[PDB]
Amino acid sequence: SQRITIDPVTRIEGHLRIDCEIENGVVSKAWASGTMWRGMEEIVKNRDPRDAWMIVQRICGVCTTTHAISSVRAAESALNIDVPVNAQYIRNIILAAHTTHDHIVHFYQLSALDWVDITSALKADPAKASAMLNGVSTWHLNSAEEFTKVQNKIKDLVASGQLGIFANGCWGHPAMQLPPEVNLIAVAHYLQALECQRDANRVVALLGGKTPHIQNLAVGGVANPINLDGLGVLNLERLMYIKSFIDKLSDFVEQVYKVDTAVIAAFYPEWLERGQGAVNYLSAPEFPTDGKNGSFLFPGGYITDADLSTYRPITSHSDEYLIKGIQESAKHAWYKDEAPQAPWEGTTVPDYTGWSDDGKYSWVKAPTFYGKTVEVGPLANMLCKLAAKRESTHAKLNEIVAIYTKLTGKTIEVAQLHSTLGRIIGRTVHCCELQNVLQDQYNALIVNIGKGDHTTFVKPDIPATGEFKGVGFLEAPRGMLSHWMVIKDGIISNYQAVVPSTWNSGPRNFNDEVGPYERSLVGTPIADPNKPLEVVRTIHSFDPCMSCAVH
Amino acid sequence: SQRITIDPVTRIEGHLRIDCEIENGVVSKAWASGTMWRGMEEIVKNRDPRDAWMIVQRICGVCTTTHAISSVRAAESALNIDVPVNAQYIRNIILAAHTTHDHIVHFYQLSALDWVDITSALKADPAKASAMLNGVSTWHLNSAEEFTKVQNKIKDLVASGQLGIFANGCWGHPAMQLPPEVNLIAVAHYLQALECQRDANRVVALLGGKTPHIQNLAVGGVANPINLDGLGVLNLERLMYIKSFIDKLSDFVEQVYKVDTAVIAAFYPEWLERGQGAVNYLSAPEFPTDGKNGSFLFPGGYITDADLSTYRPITSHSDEYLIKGIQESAKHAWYKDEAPQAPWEGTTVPDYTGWSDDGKYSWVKAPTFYGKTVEVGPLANMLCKLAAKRESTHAKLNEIVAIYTKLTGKTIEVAQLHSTLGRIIGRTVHCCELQNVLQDQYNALIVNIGKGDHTTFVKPDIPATGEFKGVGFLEAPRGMLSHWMVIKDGIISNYQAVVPSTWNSGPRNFNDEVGPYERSLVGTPIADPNKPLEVVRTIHSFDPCMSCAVH
Amino acid sequence: PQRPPVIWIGAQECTGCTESLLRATHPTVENLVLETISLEYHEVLSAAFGHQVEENKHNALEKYKGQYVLVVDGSIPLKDNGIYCMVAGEPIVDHIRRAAEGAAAIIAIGSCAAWGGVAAAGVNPTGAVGLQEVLPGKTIINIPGCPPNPHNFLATVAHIITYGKPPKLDAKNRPTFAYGRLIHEHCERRPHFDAGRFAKEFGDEGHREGWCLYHLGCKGPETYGNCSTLQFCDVGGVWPVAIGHPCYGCNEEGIGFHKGIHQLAHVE
Amino acid sequence: PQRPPVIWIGAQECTGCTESLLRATHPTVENLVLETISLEYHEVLSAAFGHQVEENKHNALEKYKGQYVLVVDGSIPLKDNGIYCMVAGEPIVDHIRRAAEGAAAIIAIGSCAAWGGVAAAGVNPTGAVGLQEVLPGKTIINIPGCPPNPHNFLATVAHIITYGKPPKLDAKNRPTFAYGRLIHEHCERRPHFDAGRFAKEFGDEGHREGWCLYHLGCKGPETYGNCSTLQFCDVGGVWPVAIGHPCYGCNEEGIGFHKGIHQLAHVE
């Protein structure tokens, strides 16, 4: 039984340590550890409920926007506020555009170099690389000439002997299975992605006031002043500018990102056969479109036993079934109180004891839903949508499968979605569907303004006395996010965040059940224990965010 | 025998009427007429010399920048001002970036539809079109996929009821000689050009304060405040932004515009054999780099009898030889005073007599240099630089000719440059060399600021009494520009502009010699006198600007 | 789908207002003409010339009667019976009045068309006037500036297309979203003005700290527009005052091209 | 041609400061990393992980001793002997003191690294401090904001590379080009502030006219920065108050994360 540690795990957000036991070239047991804590839950305590979102947004700047919106939703929940529909349109556009940037960056900047060897890309024939994409994609930047410009940038980087960021990576590793040509294709796409994600953030910026960290929200709605005829406010000219960037996203997402995920899968088919993190999945519905915080564009729900037939829909952020099930345990985390806590009754009292395989080993709490461990994130959200018979999701998944089929002569069944590649696929599908969310919600805003509705804000009435508890759900890039606020005598008496990477990276829980990261690693083949590329591959599929996991 | 009129000539700036007599299907005689007048010379009169540039910039918005810089240079000449060298770097960067936008738009938006048939492009095979460019250009946007997307846009436009801009053009006209594939290529590049020209103007905007119509000049220098450590002024961050846009220009210029020039020439070889407008050529030296208004990056001069050995260089904007030679005559224009006038003594009093074939027929004056008719513009500037043995110009021209040769197996001698396509080639060569001007001058500005020089402005001493005269020369996108200012008792007593298109589009002069547009048309074959595309082709090669020509 | 028709006629124009379209980003000029409108007549851009371009105009005037927006840049010269601007052998005034009859809406883009502009300044040799003067019984939308930010025009056209009516207008028929406020009443240098922090000459210490330009002759105090906020070219931070030169008042009748650059706003 | 080495260490960071680079345009991140600098260590972007990436750090620290610029984002937790941020089994405070030894220059990017920021607010659970407090005797360039405009950082690095010295700094060691002035002393809504034209509640008449946000709790009056001028994302017109929300004072110690959103600022 050989012991390895990967610390730091790079190409994630935040500070993560992964330990594995390896027996007979295969990991037999794992531990995931969040190694940095800030105490954000305590930092926002005792403040006006209206101030929380600006503070708690700083839980993470990668999934910026998410904690901000979840925080206001939680205050709105506590105070029984109906959000103006214009304010929902605005929040929705921001969330969808942000998640667009987020998924693109995760696939390319954070994940690609797990599966792609840049040194191999040097050996490629650009003409052949370009040719093998004919009839596979309509992207306009797949020319031999584009690929050569990219190849020369790599050559020159290598020539300088300053590889920097790209130095000492897993080049030449036995698990790198792409031909030189598709290595070069992917690197060219990596660079192109950076343009696409910038456009996505320009959408976020025009509504948020900037990004990272938007600044246009309020408990009660948004701070954008809608006035078609106003100077210096959200007028038609500004809305046209927003639309201009929304329109630039779809092609890269559909013709590159979507196609590259089927291509990666085609060359790594056994990764559809490992990396399962859980048999239980949860997602919240997202993108409300009425004046009552409901009518979501995306459905949510709960699946158990890896069986879509068990699908229990969740179509309301006020669903008591969802609210009552959630608890967190610090039995194996560095906090004092170890029994499972409902977040409204949660505590976060640090108790650092150092690393113990059998005791406490992480700053991440271990969440459960009615006692079960649950994977959250795009896989969970895809499975829920499939189970809900959302035609759009089936159609989009089938589009990716169809490309995989053209490439391999094989198909992908729902059973193979419980896997490292299935998880990657769920995220790509999410990103693709979000482009229609952006178009629909922009149009809805335009038409609603046309009807004469410029309302963006409902003034919160926060009573000077009495206790109020609120919970704000949000389906973030990485999974179901929830903020839990208790107000007492007009100020925050308790605040607890249960974040998607908390579900996934959580350590062993109150009954010692390992979390999704830890479960997913069991069975991972290791060619070289000094270069455990294979574990990093699986862990990256969850898109770890540790400032999120720990806060 | 047959008489035709083309009124309006489209795809130029301003209002131009062209009349032709046709004999045996060939034009035997032509008239060029500027049909709109504003009286900009009269409008500036009696004002502070410092006010002129903001007013006369409005002579033109296509060649914005040019009249502003020429106007300040004229006031500076009158008052013997040495322009601070940083202000020169800034003026030059603006002029070179603007001219880059100008030339690109002229080749594509103004000119290509003379040579390119959009209906034929629909019939093209995108894969064939892309394959033709293999080894011809390294541009990254020549893929079959790009060309398909472009083809579909045209298909969709035609399919709709509404061709708009493209309605009722010379589609199917016998002088349209491009194959479907090359038509498609050119239309794809027409669209891509629009991005390149936008980037060129972002450079202009960041120093000028906006475009069209910059606002950063002064008699005495510029209004940009250089201070690397200052908030809200021209600091290192702003300069870096400028550089980011400068860097974006060169690939399209070198790999698309330069290449398309040769392919157009490849399919239109006879257009190297007609369209000569003159045997005499004039240009001003340009882009001063010292603190004494000299040391020009580009040389200027005078050439007679279509013979480069006659080249008399001009290396100073205060060269009397150039200053003494210039006169204008309204013998055949709608002004009262008809004998040739030196511009310091020029008048501009309207005398509209309506059209007369033998009398007056234009609002454009007819300029001469020592009594001779002269062509100005990029062909003039190219010829002068070649005559001056400027290695950069020869090298750049040779690159274009070599592409021609790769395409045709034929060559281009200097003799053939005296033509419609030679004039087009001059313009392309000018755009290409200007990219090095941008790099050079940006770097010079950066090093000079690092030496501690942040001077941008010397306050002018303007005497309350006495007479002073100055001339400001500038090599504009369409040729040598000159603004002639007389100051009397603190104010402007006379102001005369002699503009490049005045030289080229001028009507018969005092000695009845036709101007360059008029000469260029003799010999032009006409397939259809009701659609004289062949005339429009040659005239467009001069890049007419009639608000400039007439002012 | 069918795109709203636009007919564009240039009178005494420097073509700067057309050129502003080439700087536009929302929409870009190519998305403008391929997706948002049908540009049925435009002399600067049209493939057709001469007799074929006049065919295009009459055909569009007929086919899209009562549906097109008519745009005019440049001033209209009234002196000597219109002869100072003649296209296809007729005064530009005539082309314009004919086009105005079938117009769904009429826009004067640029200060020249809005109020005569530079061409009508000084002694006004051609008797240049604004479009509203030429078309006295029609409601003309004025979009001034020399040239305005193209989106002042584009968002006005988009309002008509999207919502079926022009945007809200001030007393001078300028869209309020762009011209409802003095530049000075929304200028980022106002604190320097308030504190008496003034640039006195270009290149001086105050100038190089981004101080107020009032004493360089800034016309912001009497010029309505959106130059300080919308600014220009969508790159961020660019308008004349931000790059270091006073507003000249080009938007505003009686200011731009009347007052000296360095004449103070409180001086007539 | 060799590129200047940079070593980036993340302490208690939300990654927003690294993310700001992905919005940059001059240079873009890809141009930054391939052309402008050599980014020798960065946890978020490095191909290598674990032992391999820690090798890269050790190698770069040695090879470029006295040459690299060290960047730190996130606060540094000192409580309980540094255990609140541990990478590769050691307190981040130790990684940072080691790397600071051979640094040519040292930059604290973001308010967390500059002065403790949000992570040191309230009761400060981890005893988080700013970089200057952990590195006494060293000159720390502070580029605050949460996160700053990435060009506040990029132009600082560029000044260092191009002219061999840091840009001019204020008393708090912030580059004057970006932090030399109160936002309120260069804010385009100052005229409304002066006139008494205030938004009182999001969505009200004044708010929808773009009036001053002082009474919504704008911290512009007590916050140094360039948010009103350079603004954000290089699209033009984008900063928090332009969008309709008060400045929170995220740049400024004692303001952001200490005062309530709707708490009024002091005005000089």
Ligand code: NFU
């Ligand atoms: N997506 C996301 Fe965060 Ni940095 C996680 N985990 C979210 O709430």
Ligand code: NFU
């Ligand atoms: N280039 C140019 Fe203009 Ni519209 C001409 N002719 C000139 O000065």
Ligand code: SF4
């Ligand atoms: S307004 Fe200015 S830009 Fe438009 S035409 Fe008149 S002068 Fe040219």
Ligand code: SF4
């Ligand atoms: S610069 Fe012009 S507009 Fe801005 S404050 Fe000073 S005077 Fe007013």
Ligand code: SF4
């Ligand atoms: S400064 Fe703001 S953005 Fe940078 S790390 Fe601290 S919280 Fe995140």
Ligand code: SF4
């Ligand atoms: S309070 Fe805020 S919004 Fe009002 S002027 Fe000052 S900075 Fe601008």
Ligand code: F3S
């Ligand atoms: S001169 Fe004109 S463009 Fe704006 S800043 Fe002044 S109004």
Ligand code: F3S
């Ligand atoms: S909150 Fe921060 S980003 Fe600028 S506007 Fe205020 S300082």
Ligand SMILES: [Mg+2]
């Ligand atoms: Mg928590």
Ligand SMILES: [Mg+2]
């Ligand atoms: Mg003249």
